[PDB]
Write a protein that holds these residues in place. Structure first.
Motif, short mmCIF file in Angstrom:
data_model
loop_
_atom_site.label_atom_id
_atom_site.label_comp_id
_atom_site.label_asym_id
_atom_site.label_seq_id
_atom_site.Cartn_x
_atom_site.Cartn_y
_atom_site.Cartn_z
N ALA A 180 -62.55 24.30 -36.51
CA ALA A 180 -61.10 24.15 -36.56
C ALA A 180 -60.54 24.98 -37.73
CB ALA A 180 -60.74 22.66 -36.72
N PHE A 181 -59.22 25.19 -37.75
CA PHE A 181 -58.55 26.02 -38.76
C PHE A 181 -57.21 25.45 -39.26
CE2 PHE A 181 -56.56 30.02 -40.33
CZ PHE A 181 -57.52 30.37 -41.29
N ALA A 198 -53.84 19.82 -46.05
CA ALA A 198 -53.16 19.84 -47.34
C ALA A 198 -51.92 20.76 -47.39
CB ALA A 198 -54.19 20.21 -48.42
N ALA A 199 -51.82 21.76 -46.50
CA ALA A 199 -50.61 22.58 -46.30
C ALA A 199 -49.64 21.98 -45.26
CB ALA A 199 -51.03 24.00 -45.92
N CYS A 200 -50.10 21.04 -44.43
CA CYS A 200 -49.26 20.27 -43.51
C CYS A 200 -48.62 19.06 -44.22
CB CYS A 200 -50.11 19.86 -42.30
SG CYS A 200 -49.20 19.07 -40.95
N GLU A 201 -49.39 18.29 -44.99
CA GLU A 201 -48.94 17.15 -45.80
C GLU A 201 -47.79 17.52 -46.74
OE1 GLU A 201 -49.37 13.82 -45.37
OE2 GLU A 201 -51.07 13.32 -46.64
N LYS A 216 -49.54 15.39 -39.63
CA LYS A 216 -50.44 15.46 -38.47
C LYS A 216 -50.64 16.90 -37.99
CE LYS A 216 -52.15 12.55 -36.96
NZ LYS A 216 -53.52 12.16 -37.36
N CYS A 217 -51.89 17.31 -37.74
CA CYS A 217 -52.20 18.57 -37.06
C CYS A 217 -53.26 18.41 -35.95
CB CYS A 217 -52.57 19.67 -38.06
SG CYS A 217 -54.08 19.42 -39.04
N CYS A 227 -45.18 15.83 -38.29
CA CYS A 227 -45.35 14.54 -38.93
C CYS A 227 -45.36 13.39 -37.89
CB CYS A 227 -44.26 14.33 -39.98
SG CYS A 227 -43.79 15.73 -41.07
N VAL A 228 -45.94 12.25 -38.25
CA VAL A 228 -46.04 11.06 -37.37
C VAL A 228 -44.68 10.37 -37.13
CG1 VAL A 228 -48.47 10.69 -38.06
CG2 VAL A 228 -46.67 9.44 -39.25
N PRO A 229 -44.48 9.63 -36.02
CA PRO A 229 -43.24 8.91 -35.73
C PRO A 229 -43.07 7.58 -36.50
CG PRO A 229 -44.78 8.46 -33.96
CD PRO A 229 -45.41 9.48 -34.91
N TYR A 230 -44.16 7.09 -37.12
CA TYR A 230 -44.21 5.84 -37.89
C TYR A 230 -43.34 5.89 -39.14
CZ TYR A 230 -48.65 5.20 -35.09
OH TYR A 230 -49.61 5.05 -34.14
#
Length: 33
Positions: free
Chosen positions: A3-4, A8-11, A22-23, A30-33
């Motif tokens: 995977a790629f 830590a760049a998504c958060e 989330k990726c 991001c999550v719906p929660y």
């Protein structure tokens, strides 16, 4: 796959907003929660 995602760049686009990064398939959201 497999995977790629840099999680830590998504958060850093989610964590300051009060939700989790989330990726899946190198697609960052991001999550719906």
């Amino acid at each position: 796959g497999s995977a790629f995602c840099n999680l830590a760049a998504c958060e850093l686009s989610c964590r300051s907003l009060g939700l989790l990064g989330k990726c899946i398939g190198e697609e960052c959201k991001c999550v719906p929660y």
